[model samples]
Target: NIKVVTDLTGTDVSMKKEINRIAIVPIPWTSIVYAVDGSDKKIVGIHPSAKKSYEASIFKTLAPDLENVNSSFVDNNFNVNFEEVAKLKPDVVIIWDYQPEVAKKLKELGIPAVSIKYGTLEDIQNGIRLLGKILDKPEQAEALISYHKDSEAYFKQKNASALPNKPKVLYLQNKNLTVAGNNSVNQLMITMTGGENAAKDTKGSWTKVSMEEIMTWDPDIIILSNFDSIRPDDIYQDKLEGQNWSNIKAVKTHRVYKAPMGIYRWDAPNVETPLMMKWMGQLIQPDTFNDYILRDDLKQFYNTFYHYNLTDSEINTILNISINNTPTF
Candidate 1:
């Protein structure tokens, strides 16, 4: 059955009746494809950075011959090579919402390109359903959708009135004062876990604030985003020169944490978001929420979605946000 999907850019992409060859440019959407039970061989091409990250190890585990798959798309600097994409000969291309120009060019080449946005939980669900429709795997898609809904409901119930007072939370990006704004998924997670974004009043999704502003806001807790140039311990230790992080309430109280990096970033919308929510709930309101059974959740999620069983050691490696520990599949 032929399927027509309107991308995030409002481009109506008409997919072939049988889309055996698929290409995904953005790294996050790879998790969605795997969750939908799309065969490893079906993914013809992917962005190089996606493979360079931990997810590539995951792909190796899933399909040891994954090296045979093309890594023609260079994700860095948002660059997409038209000639390289053409060499892949993909039946359809999946891209991030930011790549409308690439999608348009692909469309012009008589190829279907769908833009997927994963900034919010709803976007992740809808993206999965859309991919399921394109891949002709409705049953897999529905199962994943149901799982996500159930996870959200479970955490929401568990963390109901969880916090006595909403904690002022700040999610730092790579730079010292760069943080997630109210509109970002990080803010949504913070709010869901009964915390108030310290930068809620700040405009734009990702914003860089001044040290004086950070001191003014004085967040109760600080959460560091995934694997980057900076580390949580560095922030706690005031590793960045010319800064006195010890003055902050969160730093003094030792309430800083690094965001978990699973198959994809838990901070971002992905298959593991529900688990991420539960983890955040445990962090923000430890008194009200139960100890996060990360190992159990990882085992369950991978078994159900990726069809891969994770060991306790593997789960620990993935959960550990220390700069020294890099988990591989």
Candidate 2:
């Protein structure tokens, strides 16, 4: 028997050196479709619709290519294939903390699955470390962990140095914008970035807030997550007006800001997370990087990450969609 170091966060697995015979269940929040091209293709299972664009577009962790996986794992009407899971007979399964039912089912099949909680960037780092430990790539994992730490620390320091009257910010998206409460990672980012979120503290995740209540709060800064379907110009300036919306302090001042395109999920599982501090710094400080389009760095990032060259035109697309850029969606 090969001796292995185990931390036992979720499913129990036997390891011989590096992680051998592994199975991954999707952790939709941090799951990205662009996993290392050949990292490990023998995936025994996936979470249903965990990759759907609307459900996960902002997070960017959903695999864009999962439509082709063909294991009924993502089919809209399909259920988890327990028999198929038994066939693959993975050493361990990684279950999300939110997906308790899925994990319970796997246990009945005698498959060892465990819950992993990923809530903040710190948790994000912990998860990477946990995976590395299980996979026995401690050395590489340590290196990545160090990189994230240094980058996070540097950006946090940078953001801290730049501060004015912190903006009163409200973040929302329309699959019904009011559906969000104040406790999600969305509000956490706002607070970390030095903004006051407008939602009430009634719940921890998304909960609906009425328009009248929002008017009363009247935040100075508004952040839109799903700007694709709603244009900032058309939204606050047009339709939402004539109904006490324009009376709101932010609307009167026109301080609504759309995030730079792709920033929604940019902070998860990508190097961009570090620079998010820079974005927040720039937003709060406003003039820290006046000469630079922070996104120029992102262009270079895309080149490195996607290996696809970006043209001036493509860069324009990103800029046009940035904070106040138009095209509505």
Candidate 3:
């Protein structure tokens, strides 16, 4: 039984050789845990946001018992609840690297914790590999890595013959004038898919831009994340406040698209990134990837990694096609 292994924070922490109960303070890692084939019953606690209808559906199909797991201790804003976490009494706590306060609190309570930083390709893949070592699921982790590699190869082949032009893209959040900046994971996705991020020159993450700024960039492609408060129609109709989007090139060409959400957001790092890459390739060079069937690829992805057999209807529903309303490039 090993006493400790260094966490992503470079802190040495004692841990059980066989961890039986796990607590997930960050919601996104729940998908990664599922990817490693960790038993849902072994998860003692989870953040509430992880159980939301949109997020939970990704794993609920495979681990229905997750519905009964204790989830009240989760802190959506990363402001952890120490007393609640203490009550859960997990063998170890898993959190995002950015939650220093949570890490300190867990340490104060003598609870072993490991931090993960997810966003970039390296971060996600390394995080997965680290989780595999911690959870004793090396094979599962390797399998996921291989799947990611295979997907990357698939896209590279599909994109090889496409024009060398990299279209300028703008990824907007549902909030007013917020956009993905150069430092964000969203930019990684954009650049990896052969598109130039319109906000690349903007510093920091998810920066707020004025309508004037957007007009100045006038990206060739505009991508919107799913949010009930805002929809692609709002952008297309120029219904957003303080913006005259009618003259934008994307609007004129109808190049707007809603980013897809499956096990997690395709815009960010998750197990579904490979699928996101494929979709982005199709979006970037539709003529080259016109025959690419997203539904089939998604089915294969879920079946292979999460071990859930998806029906055509489920795949269609998972894709949530309202986001796919965009012009073919």
Candidate 4:
């Protein structure tokens, strides 16, 4: 029953095919594990915040039982409870690539920890490939990867990167004055969708900046992260009274939008991000990209990969077309 599989760390981790219980630490990968497995039976534990995030997501509706999984093994701040993890007795603990100490701790505890590197689109694809190798479900992982690669080609065929007059996009990391820096996935998403990253010059991940710095950049579009309660209306009407958003071009023209959430936040490097790319493409270059195509794309993707045929209404909900009282697009 024991087989060795290497993770992003390249560590030969031993696991059992007949009986492997998964414990996921990263927020996005928790759902990603579901995506590849197409079931939650093996997912014995997950990160607490991801559990909360899943409650507000469509994946919760699809795979409802994940809500019942034990989330106590890892807290919101990524502090791993060694004893709780021991209680769960997971065959493997999925973690971030940077958590050497956490992996080591788990290693000492006799729990195999699998790591996934984040950020770029390439990293996301390779991680999925690794998830396939580790899960022993190579088919599902390859299908998603194939869809993703096909989407990549579709955008390039349309010459998205070479499109003239690319919109200068600013990634609103949250309700705070934070923005996505060069290393953030937001930067790569914007570039691929034919929009320029306004904060690309800022080094590292999410970087905080002043109103003066934002005014200097003067981005034409703003993409809000799903991690917060920010909305297009907030930027449009300047809901945060302290923050001056009136003069921003994106706000004035109503180009600010909250990223869509499907199985996982589209802002994150999840399996659903290829569709997210099309959504961004439609938003950034409406003249070239079509929402009609994207609607059908979602229908086919869900039906094919997840084996759940989405209703027309559910598609609209996924597109965030006037969902709830919040204004998007």
Backbone clash tally (model 3): 1
Candidate models: Cα lDDT each: 0.75, 0.54, 0.75, 0.81
Clashing residue pairs in all predictions, respectively, total 0, 8, 1, 0
User: Candidate 4 has which clashing residue pairs, if any?
Assistant: none
lDDT of 2 by residue, 222-328 (tens): 76654345446655655653344677677787766555544234423343465455455456555543444556665655555445455665544444445464332
Please give the range of 10 consecutive residues that has the lowest summed lDDT in model 4. 320-329
* C-alpha-based local distance difference test score of model 2: 0.54
The lDDT of model 4 is 0.81
Deviation (Å) of 235 in candidate 2? 1.1
Q: Over all chains combined, what TM-score does candidate 3 have?
A: 0.85
Worst 10 residues of 1 by lDDT: 320-329
The window of 10 residues in a row where model 3 has the poorest summed lDDT is 320-329
**Candidate 1 Cα errors over 4 Å, as ranges:** 1-14, 55-64, 74-79, 96-108, 158-163, 321-329
Runs in model 3 lying further than 4 Å from the true structure: 1-4, 53-57, 74-77, 98-110, 152-163, 287-292, 326-329
- Error (Å) of candidate 3 at residue 95 is 2.6
Question: How do the predictions measure up, each by TM-score?
Answer: 0.85, 0.71, 0.85, 0.89
Q: List the residue pairs that clash in candidate 2.
A: 10-114, 11-114, 19-135, 31-61, 33-63, 181-207, 228-329, 231-328
lDDT comparison, 1 vs 2, better candidate: 1
lDDT of 3 by residue, 1-329 (tens): 75576777787778888877888877777767777764565777777877774343656677787788777786567777788878888888888888777777888997878888765776777778877777888898988898888877776766533358778899888658889888887887676677888999998777888889989999999888754346667878878778788988888898877777776566667878888777777777666667667777788777777667887556655565645553221
lDDT of 1 by residue, 1-329 (tens): 67777666666888888988888888777656867854565888866776666442454566554566677665577587888777777889888788778877987877788887755788888888888888888888988899899888876786644556688999888755778987787887888788878998988778888888889999998888874657667878788876778889988887777776677677678887887887777777766666556567778778877778876656665666344332331
